[PDB]
């Protein structure tokens, strides 16, 4: 499954993980869930995090913010009033805060999520395309919270997304 995406992959997170000091991970989209299939260790960490084949359901998720992107936006409505992807007190404005909340990680070029599924652990992830401009992956970088504040974030975002963009260009795909 997914494999020129898990091949081309590889030798950029390794590279990023060399440079951020953090784990590195590829995920993928399964509709209701974002998976890990492919990740390079932090060379500090405590917690094992985004290990292989683990999956991320909550909307708060960076990962999962990245592939909602992708959906229209009446399927993510029905994900969050559904329980499918989770995400506290849904109401009409929480729905339509989160769903301004995706179109801003796409013009950032990363999602984040700064201690808000888990008061211990950050994340930033961005997307990839394929030559068609479909969405098919995004990079991930978690780490724990104690080490990195608003700044060290802002930094992985663009580390992030940097290296999904070398992903995306040795896939032959281009952005939206």
């Not at 997914?2 to 060399?18: D, F, G, I, M, S």
Request: contains cysteine.
């Amino acid at each position: 499954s997914n494999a020129e995406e898990r091949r081309v992959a590889y030798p950029v997170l390794r590279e990023l993980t060399e440079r951020t000091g953090e784990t590195s991970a590829l995920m993928v989209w399964n509709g209701n869930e974002s998976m890990c299939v492919e990740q390079i260790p932090s060379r500090h960490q405590v917690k094992h995090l985004a290990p292989l084949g683990a999956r991320y359901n909550e909307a708060l998720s960076s990962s999962v913010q990245v592939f909602l992107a992708s959906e229209n936006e009446d399927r993510v409505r029905q994900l969050l009033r559904s329980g499918s992807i989770t995400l506290t007190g849904v109401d009409e404005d929480a729905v339509e805060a989160y769903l301004l909340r995706l179109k801003e990680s796409m013009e950032r070029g990363w999602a984040v999520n700064f201690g808000e599924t888990s008061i211990e652990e950050v994340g930033v992830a961005s997307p990839v395309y394929d030559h068609r401009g479909n969405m098919v992956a995004s990079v991930l970088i978690p780490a724990p919270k104690f080490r990195v504040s608003q700044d060290t974030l802002n930094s992985l975002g663009e580390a992030c997304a940097a290296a999904a963009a070398k992903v995306t260009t040795r896939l032959g795909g281009r952005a939206p």
